[PDB]
Design a protein around this ligand. Structure first.
Ligand SMILES: [Cl-]
Ligand SMILES: [Cl-]
Ligand SMILES: [Cl-]
Lengths: 158, 157
């Protein structure tokens, strides 16, 4: 086993995987935001109902979406190139769908129903959530491939 | 001894990944803070729609409790994980304790920024957010050092 070269493959694969994990976590944060649709912080630490004031919550989801795109615009690794480009495209289609639906998602008093169509995966139509789901799938594929590359480099140490 | 070093690399990678996930959740709160008082515009910019921040803050709060849960699930890092976990609880509790300004209809931009906008020159949570950020940076640095040092062992003679 050429330990110098295996060392470099491990380092590079870890660096890709770290960047992918950061993007996956940012996607997870949008799922958390979706739990706050139509909600407020109560004194008892629960979320209480306060329907139909979701505009700045959705602006937060949008800002996170553009950060995801910026990370994917810079990230690279052989057989990851296509998966990264695909994820970057999906991330742009998500942001574009939100912007295109500004007349429902970017007004005073954005309704719970419209916010759910943008970012709540459990929503049953699409104002962004289908693009969010495709983005999640694209990142899962990228993660699986990045993890397999790291696992293969570590295995060469036998 | 490559079997022992491989284990150290895979375990250190796994810890580092878990730490980076938490740091990225904290990053998302910093991005939420950019949306205080804002709405999505047709041209892709954020436009002003002031003083409707309660559900945005409920989102930050939800993320903050997830941070604590992930830290609860995490060698050589015990003290730094415990510090980060405590800081994360203190941030969530500060938000909840400020419900009278952060959990009402029409939360103002000013009060939202005192909760989650770092370096806000105008405390309703930001100081706790900043302490949490520093505690996760210290944990991240330690986890990175443990991975880097394990990898460096591979080529030692
Ligand atoms: Cl559309
Ligand atoms: Cl974990
Ligand atoms: Cl008030």
């Amino acid at each position: 086993p050429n330990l110098t070269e295996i060392s470099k493959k491990i380092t590079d694969s870890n660096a890709v995987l770290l960047a992918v994990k950061e993007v996956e976590a940012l996607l997870s944060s949008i799922d958390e935001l979706a739990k706050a649709i139509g909600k407020k912080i109560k004194n008892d630490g629960s979320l209480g109902d306060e329907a139909n004031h979701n505009e700045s919550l959705l602006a937060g989801a949008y800002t996170i979406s553009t950060l995801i795109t910026q990370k994917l615009s810079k990230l690279n690794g052989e057989g990851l190139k296509e998966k990264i480009a695909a994820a970057k495209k999906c991330s742009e289609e998500f942001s574009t769908k939100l912007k295109d639906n500004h007349a429902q998602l970017g007004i005073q008093g954005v309704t719970d129903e419209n916010a759910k169509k943008a970012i709540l995966k459990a929503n049953a139509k699409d104002k962004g959530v289908e693009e969010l789901e495709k983005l999640s799938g694209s990142l899962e594929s990228l993660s699986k491939a990045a993890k397999e590359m790291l696992a293969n480099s570590v295995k060469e140490l036998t």
